RNA sequence: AUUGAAAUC
RNA sequence: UAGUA
RNA sequence: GAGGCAGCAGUUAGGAAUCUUCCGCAAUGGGCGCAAGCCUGACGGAGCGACGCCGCUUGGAGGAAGAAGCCCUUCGGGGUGUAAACUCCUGAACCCGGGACGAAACCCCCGACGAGGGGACUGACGGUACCGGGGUAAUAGCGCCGGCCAACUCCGUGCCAGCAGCCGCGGUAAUACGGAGGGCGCGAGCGUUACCCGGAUUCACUGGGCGUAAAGGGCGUGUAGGCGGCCUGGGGCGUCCCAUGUGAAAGA
């Protein structure tokens, strides 16, 4: 089971995540299959969220449960918003 | 027998010029001819021409110097100051077009043999092809 | 692509198998000179169809033995028992080489 | 005008019965910082005159330095006995990067951007001459052009 | 930190008048008016032919000791230059000139870099309104270097602006005197400064 | 050598070796004295130069020099070795660190103080 | 003591 | 015989 | 019979030498669960150690033809030195007030358990960061000064005591030892020792050599191996060119 999820970059008290797909069994900040966005929980840039939303839809299509909070973000950039 | 006909040629030339001979022979090969025309075209030799000496083909190379110079030692400046074989039969040398060297901020030249034929470095850069880095002159 | 090599058969003194000598050449990594180098391969011959001296193509293949990993594709030219001769000499060279 | 930096002084020595006898040696450059330098070697009983002599001899010995913008035309290497020197052209911002000896020649010649290497026997005198003979051997697009024309 | 201790003492030693006290190292004694020779017992003694090293060294000590700066800090900027596009020598000077603690000086809000520093450390200064307290802050073009409207009423700020009331300033610096603010127009060019120092030697000191 | 030669033979990394078997790299080693003597130096020098034999935790036993103007070292002293030769005492290739273990710092020592292991006096304070 | 010593009284 | 030009 | 920290801590031993038996699942991530949740020394944090990098502090402006003290001195003088003392100014530390982002999901309701919309809970770090008010002149050391290499005088000492990276200093005038004054260089560091690259074109591919400096085999024969004259044609293995795929992330 492959997962859309968050990997942690940045520094101490400087969290910066990378929206990644990866086999569930890999380490959090381990190797990943593809980067498909990023996310700054502190919203310090005017651009603190981004998602290749075609790709997001691809990985879902081949089946890849997102972390509950990684799907929250995918929602925010309308990965699931249709019509 | 002779191990490097080309290297021998560059030398014959090198040797003749330092005693300021007006001319040298070098036994003849078409590949030798092709190098000669570069020297010729690029202004290092007055020119070559074919002759048959003692019954066999040579190329008579006509050398080219400077004006009689001023003070003690009036020997002319050489036009060919430095002719040097690069790709010897011992260690063959090949640049691709990216690695073709520019001899002496351009004031030099590097005869260089390609599938488009025997070329100067700028000629070959322009034609976009590398090959056997034959020698260099200046 | 299954790597396809071509060498010389230098032994068929095995059942359904030929030793093939593949020679390779290249710019020496540090010293420039083009050096030659070579490797014998054990190649699979189900019809004992090839013999001493045939120059043969040779293909990367499904394992047949511990060390049989290639099958004999086509034959390029018969004869060439000169190349065979050269391998055989290097061998008995080693004889006059011990203590 | 002519600037003059002294590179080396040394105290040599001969032998006469009962005691040593000294002399002195003077390595001095002179330059206008506009493509004209000279080098001289002065020898004399006392330093001052050795220096002063060096000066005299240096002006008597000057050179063409084709100065394609603070650097030199192309890359010469020159061997003087066991001393080699390599000169390499550099873009501005670099500097005269060399040893005390090649530097103070190159500088007083009106060079500002140059790359060098003392190779082999680094004896200053021999190094010094080499460097001059390197300068003295520099050519330019013009001269080469004149040469090969005919 | 910084330097600490005797300043218009290096006024001397370098042999060229340094302004490190501002007002006095400027007025009939930076001691260069009295004893323009190096300090200590062997001061007014005969110099010797200084070495090609000694020479490059002092020139660096000269340039650095001007701007009041750490060797470790100085040297980072230098290397930080060089690899950066263009003529190393100047650019370095540029970057040195772009230090707040110095702009503040250059822009008249203080009489010395030393005093100018303290104003930065005590937040008396702002860049684009936000209060800055780093003497190292690299001022880029367009930035406005304000006085803290909170600090305006200091006897030191008043008195030191009333002096620049008439005074003209840097061909790369603007200055509104009454609203106590100035501008960083552009990096200076070597010629813009009359720095009593040969930057080419400073390049050489860090080459050997 | 010809290129073929270099191709057959290559070159060879000279890699000359340690001046200090204080073993395992080891920037320092601990040791116990065995013998504290005095040694006549050599070449063109003369003086009664102090030096100890040391039994090493590296399994070794080496003579090490005792710097400083006077010392507190006798037979079973236990000490730290730092390396650095003497030169005038042939065969002495290590120094003793003063101010570590039973080797005291040097008394009344005001100048090069961190070497010789002598703490800052408060006499001018 | 001699020459700074070693030797030597 | 030692250091010492 | 029981056991197996090279999980986190910690103990002990070896060693020149390496941390807290800490807080929290709040975040990210993993397991199980329809869910609520339960588990997680992965983790997220605090602790210790100048071990490293970066920022910052020990003040700022005035202030004598120049206090004293100490150091020289040819006995007039020179130096430490605007340094201090002293006058103004700012106000690291410290006190009070306020006070985070990091956390919106899973979940509930509406809609259809979808899309979309609405609501609720939750912070270890932490009363820390940051903001506002008050406010004290408030830490400096270490190495070096014969040449290389930047910085010199005076005592003490007399091949002694000692120094020394190499060259070398010391035998009664020592810029080299020990000390003081001064000076140079760095600065919360400065030195030392160990190790790696450098310089070293001193294993030389780029880039070295062998008459006397180290270096031609005592001489041949010829094995493998290296190397190969002039002309033409075929093949395209070396070589060269174009396109394309690969060259994960981090790093530069």
UniProtKB/Swiss-Prot annotation, chain A:
Q: Does the keyword Endoplasmic reticulum apply?
A: no
Q: What is the annotated role of this protein in its UniProt record? A: Binds to the lower part of the body of the 30S subunit, where it stabilizes two of its domains.
Taxonomic source organism: Thermus thermophilus (strain ATCC 27634 / DSM 579 / HB8)
Give the similarity note: Belongs to the bacterial ribosomal protein bS16 family.
Q: What is this protein called?
A: Small ribosomal subunit protein bS16
* GO cellular component assignments: cytoplasm; small ribosomal subunit
Molecular function terms, GO-annotated = structural constituent of ribosome
User: Which terms are listed as keywords in the entry?
Assistant: Ribonucleoprotein, Ribosomal protein
The UniProt entry's GO biological process terms, in alphabetical order, are: translation
Q: Is Ribonucleoprotein among this UniProt entry's keywords?
A: yes
Q: How does it assemble?
A: Part of the 30S ribosomal subunit.
Swiss-Prot record, chain B:
**Can you cite an annotated GO cellular component?**
ribosome
Q: Which UniProt keywords apply?
A: Ribonucleoprotein, Ribosomal protein, RNA-binding, rRNA-binding
BP GO annotations: translation
Role: One of the primary rRNA binding proteins, it binds directly to 16S rRNA where it helps nucleate assembly of the platform of the 30S subunit central domain. The combined cluster of proteins S8, S12 and S17 appears to hold together the shoulder and platform of the 30S subunit.
Xref: Gene3D superfamilies: 3.30.1370.30, 3.30.1490.10
Could you tell me what this protein is called? Answer: Small ribosomal subunit protein uS8
- The portions of this protein that span the membrane are none
Q: Name one Pfam family in it.
A: Ribosomal_S8
What is an example of a GO molecular function annotated in this UniProt entry? Answer: structural constituent of ribosome
Assembly: Part of the 30S ribosomal subunit. Contacts proteins S2, S5 and S12.
Which chain positions lie within coiled-coil regions? none
SUPFAM superfamilies linked: Ribosomal protein S8
Task: State the similarity comment.
Answer: Belongs to the universal ribosomal protein uS8 family.
Curated annotation (Swiss-Prot), chain D:
What GO biological process terms are annotated to this protein in UniProt? Answer: translation
A Pfam family recorded for this sequence = Ribosomal_S5_C
Any idea which GO molecular function terms this record carries? rRNA binding; structural constituent of ribosome
Q: What is this protein called?
A: Small ribosomal subunit protein uS5
One CC-aspect GO term: small ribosomal subunit
Q: Has keyword Cytoplasm?
A: no
Look up the further comments and give them: Is positioned such that it could physically interact with spectinomycin.
Record keywords, A-Z: Ribonucleoprotein, Ribosomal protein, RNA-binding, rRNA-binding
Biological function: With S4 and S12 plays an important role in translational accuracy. Located at the back of the 30S subunit body where it stabilizes the conformation of the head with respect to the body. Binds mRNA in the 70S ribosome, positioning it for translation.
Organism from which the protein derives? Thermus thermophilus (strain ATCC 27634 / DSM 579 / HB8)
Similarity field? Belongs to the universal ribosomal protein uS5 family.
The annotated subunit structure for this chain is:
Part of the 30S ribosomal subunit. Contacts proteins S4 and S8.
Entry domain remark: The N-terminal domain interacts with the head of the 30S subunit; the C-terminal domain interacts with the body and contacts protein S4. The interaction surface between S4 and S5 is involved in control of translational fidelity.
The record's listing under InterPro entries reads: Ribosomal_Su5_D2-typ_SF, Ribosomal_uS5, Ribosomal_uS5_bac-type, Ribosomal_uS5_C, Ribosomal_uS5_N, Ribosomal_uS5_N_CS, Ribsml_uS5_D2-typ_fold_subgr
Q: Which residues form the S5 DRBM domain?
A: 2-65
Swiss-Prot record, chain F:
Annotated positions of the 3-methylthioaspartic acid modification: 88
| Record key words, sorted | Methylation, Ribonucleoprotein, Ribosomal protein, RNA-binding, rRNA-binding, tRNA-binding
Biased composition regions of type Basic residues, renumbered to the chain: 108-119
Start and end residues of each stretch annotated as Disordered: 105-125
**Free-text description of this protein's post-translational modifications in UniProt:** The methythiolated Asp-88 contacts a modifed residue of the 16S rRNA close to the decoding center, and might be important for decoding center assembly.
Q: Which CDD domains match?
A: Ribosomal_S12
A Pfam family (short name) is Ribosom_S12_S23
Q: Which GO terms describe its molecular function?
A: rRNA binding; structural constituent of ribosome; tRNA binding
Any one annotated GO CC term: small ribosomal subunit
Alphabetical GO biological process terms: translation
Enumerate the Gene3D superfamilies for this protein. Nucleic acid-binding proteins
Q: Is Ribosomal protein set as a keyword in this record?
A: yes
Q: What does this protein do?
A: With S4 and S5 plays an important role in translational accuracy.
Summarize the subunit comment. Part of the 30S ribosomal subunit. Contacts proteins S8 and S17. Interacts with IF1 in the 30S initiation complex.
The protein's matches in NCBIfam families, at most eight in alphabetical order, are given as: rpsL_bact (TIGR00981)
- Give the protein family: Belongs to the universal ribosomal protein uS12 family.
- What protein name does the entry list? Small ribosomal subunit protein uS12
Record organism = Thermus thermophilus (strain ATCC 27634 / DSM 579 / HB8)
Q: Which gene encodes it?
A: rpsL
């Amino acid at each position: 089971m492959v997962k859309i999820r968050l990997a942690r970059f940045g520094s101490k008290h400087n969290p910066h995540y990378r929206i990644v797909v990866t086999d569930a069994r890999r380490k959090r900040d381990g190797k990943y299959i593809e980067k498909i966005g990023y996310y700054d929980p502190r919203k310090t840039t005017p651009d603190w969220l981004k998602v290749d939303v075609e790709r997001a839809r691809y990985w879902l299509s081949v089946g890849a449960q997102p972390t509950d909070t990684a799907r929250r973000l995918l929602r925010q950039a309308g990965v699931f918003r249709q019509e | 027998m002779l191990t490097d006909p080309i290297a021998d040629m560059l030398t014959r030339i090198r040797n003749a010029t330092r005693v300021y001979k007006e001319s040298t022979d070098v036994p003849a090969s078409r590949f030798k001819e092709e190098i000669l025309r570069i020297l010729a075209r690029e202004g290092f030799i007055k020119g070559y021409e074919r002759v048959d000496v003692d019954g066999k083909p040579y190329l008579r190379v006509y050398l080219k110097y400077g004006p009689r110079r001023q003070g003690p030692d009036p020997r002319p400046e050489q036009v060919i100051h430095h002719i040097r074989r690069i790709s010897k039969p011992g260690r063959r040398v090949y640049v691709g077009v990216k690695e073709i060297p520019r001899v002496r901020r351009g004031l030099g030249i590097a005869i260089l043999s390609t599938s488009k034929g025997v070329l100067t470095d700028r000629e070959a850069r322009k034609l976009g092809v590398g090959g056997e880095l034959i020698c260099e002159v200046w | 692509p299954k790597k396809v090599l071509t060498g010389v058969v230098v032994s068929d003194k095995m059942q359904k198998t030929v030793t093939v000598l593949v020679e390779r050449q290249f710019p020496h990594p540090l010293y420039g000179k083009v050096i030659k180098r070579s490797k014998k391969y054990l190649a699979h011959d189900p019809e004992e169809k090839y013999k001493l001296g045939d120059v043969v193509e040779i293909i990367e293949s499904r394992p047949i033995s511990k060390r049989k990993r290639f099958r004999v594709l086509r034959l390029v030219e018969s004869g060439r028992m000169d190349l065979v001769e050269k391998y055989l000499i290097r061998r008995q060279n080693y004889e006059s080489l011990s203590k | 005008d002519f600037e003059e930096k002294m590179i080396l002084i040394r105290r040599t020595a001969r032998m006469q019965a009962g005691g040593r006898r000294f002399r002195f040696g003077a390595l001095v450059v002179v330059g206008d910082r506009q493509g004209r330098v000279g080098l001289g070697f002065g020898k004399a009983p006392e330093v001052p005159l050795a220096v002063q002599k060096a000066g005299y001899y240096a002006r008597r010995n000057m050179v063409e330095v084709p100065l394609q913008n603070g650097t030199i035309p192309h890359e010469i290497e020159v061997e003087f006995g066991a001393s080699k020197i390599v000169l390499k052209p550099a873009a501005p911002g670099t500097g005269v990067i060399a040893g005390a000896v090649p530097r103070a020649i190159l500088e007083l010649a009106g060079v500002t951007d140059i790359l060098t290497k003392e190779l082999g026997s680094r004896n200053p005198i021999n190094i010094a001459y080499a460097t001059m003979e390197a300068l003295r051997q520099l050519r330019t697009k013009a001269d080469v052009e004149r040469l090969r024309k005919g | 930190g910084r330097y600490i201790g005797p300043v218009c003492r290096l006024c001397r030693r370098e042999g060229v008048k340094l302004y490190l006290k501002g007002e006095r190292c400027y007025s009939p004694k930076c001691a260069m008016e009295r004893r323009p020779y190096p300090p200590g017992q062997h001061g007014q003694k005969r110099a010797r032919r200084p070495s090609d090293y000694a020479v490059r060294l002092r020139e660096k000590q000269k340039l650095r000791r001007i701007y009041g700066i750490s060797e470790r800090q100085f040297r980072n900027l230098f290397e930080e230059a060089s690899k950066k596009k263009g003529v190393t020598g100047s650019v370095f000077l540029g970057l040195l000139e772009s230090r707040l603690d110095n702009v503040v000086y250059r822009l008249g809000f203080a009489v010395s870099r030393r005093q100018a520093r303290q104003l930065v450390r005590h937040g008396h200064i702002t860049v684009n309104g936000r209060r800055v307290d780093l003497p190292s802050y690299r001022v880029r073009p367009g930035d406005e270097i304000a006085v803290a409207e909170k600090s305006r009423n200091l006897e030191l700020i008043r008195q030191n602006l009333e002096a620049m009331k008439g005074r003209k300033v840097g061909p790369w610096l603007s200055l509104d005197v009454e609203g106590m603010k100035g501008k960083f127009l552009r990096l200076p060019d070597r010629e813009d400064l009359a720095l009593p120092v040969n930057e080419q030697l400073v390049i050489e000191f860090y080459s050997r | 050598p010809t290129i073929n030669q270099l191709v057959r033979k290559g070159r060879e990394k000279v890699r000359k070796k340690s001046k200090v078997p204080a073993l395992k790299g080891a920037p320092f080693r601990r040791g116990v004295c065995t013998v504290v003597r005095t040694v006549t130096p050599k070449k063109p020098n003369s003086a009664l130069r102090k030096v100890a034999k040391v039994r090493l935790t590296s399994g070794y036993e080496v003579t090490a020099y005792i710097p400083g103007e006077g010392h507190n070292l006798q037979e079973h002293s236990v000490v730290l070795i730092r390396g650095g030769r003497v030169k005038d005492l042939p065969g002495v290739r290590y120094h003793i660190v003063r101010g570590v273990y039973d080797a005291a710092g040097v008394k009344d020592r005001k100048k090069s103080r961190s070497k010789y292991g002598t703490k800052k006096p408060k006499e001018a304070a």
